[PDB]
Amino acid sequence: GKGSGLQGHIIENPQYFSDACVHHIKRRDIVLKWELGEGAFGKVFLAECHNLLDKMLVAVKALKEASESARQDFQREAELLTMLQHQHIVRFFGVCTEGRPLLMVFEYMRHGDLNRFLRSHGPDAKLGPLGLGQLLAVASQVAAGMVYLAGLHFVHRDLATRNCLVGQGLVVKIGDFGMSRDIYSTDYYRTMLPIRWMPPESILYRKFTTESDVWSFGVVLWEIFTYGKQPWYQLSNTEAIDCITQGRELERPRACPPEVYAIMRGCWQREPQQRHSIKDVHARLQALAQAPPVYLDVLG
Ligand SMILES: Cc1cc(NC(=O)c2ccc(Cl)cc2Cl)n(-c2ccccc2)n1
Numbered sequence: 169g170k171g172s173g174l175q176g177h178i179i180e181n182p183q184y185f186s187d188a189c190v191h192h193i194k195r196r197d198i199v200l201k202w203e204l205g206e207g208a209f210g211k212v213f214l215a216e217c218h219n220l221l222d223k224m225l226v227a228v229k230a231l232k233e234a235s236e237s238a239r240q241d242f243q244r245e246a247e248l249l250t251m252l253q254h255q256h257i258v259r260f261f262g263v264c265t266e267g268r269p270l271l272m273v274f275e276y277m278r279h280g281d282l283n284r285f286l287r288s289h290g291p292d293a294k295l296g297p298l299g300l301g302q303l304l305a306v307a308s309q310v311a312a313g314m315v316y317l318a319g320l321h322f323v324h325r326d327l328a329t330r331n332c333l334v335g336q337g338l339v340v341k342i343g344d345f346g347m348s349r350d351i352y353s354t355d356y357y358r359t360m361l362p363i364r365w366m367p368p369e370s371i372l373y374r375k376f377t378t379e380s381d382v383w384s385f386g387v388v389l390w391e392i393f394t395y396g397k398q399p400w401y402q403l404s405n406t407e408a409i410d411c412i413t414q415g416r417e418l419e420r421p422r423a424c425p426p427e428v429y430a431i432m433r434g435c436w437q438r439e440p441q442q443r444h445s446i447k448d449v450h451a452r453l454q455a456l457a458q459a460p461p462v463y464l465d466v467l468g
Pocket of ligand 1: 169170172173245257272323325326344345346347
């Protein structure tokens, strides 16, 4: 998991420790149905898992036969994923290390990644549309997952809608399979970095922090309010990099009320220390999701 938030946390946290006691699933209890996605180092399948909770649907990541260091990384990642337990973090069920391929088992998120979900439920629908209340509920749930990660001093490093998943009844959780660099290659710039989601200190120094994650969340909000459009879509990577470092801001989306644009702007302060905390950003979004702004409302 080169440059993953999972490995970066293990490397950097001096108080972190974990024994090797992850939940093990017997290979015979996993029955693959069909492929969901493919990357350079793995494949993701939809599967049925017996004796897990009865017969239930899961997302299974299979590793393309790995070197000793790749197998050691698989183990490190599995231990940390066991620890990340939150209502808005994709649930990790365990591993299958008896025989090959090595498997990681996750809960199945039936509506797929949030970027595909937004694009298929918005204007000129990619093959019904999401209302403002639903867009705010999606934003508030990604914000809740980020509050949990910040509380652990866990830096995501790649927060974007492609790295969020959608389940039953509009449930949104942060989670990926580590293959967004292959599936969404145009969202990275070559060591591949998601520059369009990155603040100036991340581009300049490859510095990733809780504050760079807040900026990326501001970019996620803009993605949500444009129904999955790519930030700086009219520009090349080099022109986007110049916009970011020179202080150009993304425009207010048509579906975005001014009070919500103000939230994105608080995430986008060029000075990291001036960015709003994710706790405050989540509280305002949760309040708006339950009382959505109305165009031409009498405010007083
Ligand atoms: C290159 C790369 C990036 C990731 N994703 C994360 O590190 C990640 C996953 C989940 C959550 Cl909640 C937060 C984060 Cl930041 N992986 C990865 C490796 C093994 C398994 C699943 C993903 N690999």
